[PDB]
Amino acid sequence: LNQELREAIKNPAIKDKDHSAPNSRPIDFEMKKKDGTQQFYHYASSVKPARVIFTDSKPEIELGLQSGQFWRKFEVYEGDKKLPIKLVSYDTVKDYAYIRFSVSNGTKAVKIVSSTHFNNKEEKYDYTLMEFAQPIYNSADKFKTEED
Numbered sequence: 001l002n003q004e005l006r007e008a009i010k011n012p013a014i015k016d017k018d019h020s021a022p023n024s025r026p027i028d029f030e031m032k033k034k035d036g037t038q039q040f041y042h043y044a045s046s047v048k049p050a051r052v053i054f055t056d057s058k059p060e061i062e063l064g065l066q067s068g069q070f071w072r073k074f075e076v077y078e079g080d081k082k083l084p085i086k087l088v089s090y091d092t093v094k095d096y097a098y099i100r101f102s103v104s105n106g107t108k109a110v111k112i113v114s115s116t117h118f119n120n121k122e123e124k125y126d127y128t129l130m131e132f133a134q135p136i137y138n139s140a141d142k143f144k145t146e147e148d
Helices: none
Strands: 024-027 029-032 050-053 060-066 071-078 085-091 096-102 107-118 121-123 129-136
Touching (some): 071 096
Antiparallel strands (some): 024 050, 029 129, 050 060, 060 096, 071 107, 085 096, 107 121, 107 129
16 A cells, blocks of 8 residues: 555545445454463454455455554554555545455464554554454465466
């Protein structure tokens, strides 16, 4: 992505648009860190639904959230492997922000970064963990690569 997440909520090209299609299935998760945070108290960081988009053995995943005026930046890692984020669609009437990223092979647990600043307050990260409902995968048994 080319911008800060907070600026993307007003950028006109993605504001007032969607994307939803039969080319996908839903997913969900658990979240925490080692200091004893368990995500449920703020609606942007709280545990969420998602959707897995049909690809090769590295799939793509789509994520939407609210408090879009509060979040400032996001990053997703599995070990050293970064899952690269892009903008998809936004709604400043719902205070809503929505993104996509390209996933590693069959992901089960993820190292997460998220940043916040609203009002006088600042709420920044050191470390965060997500863990799966089921493997984030593509169903390779039907397609991996079809070439000649």
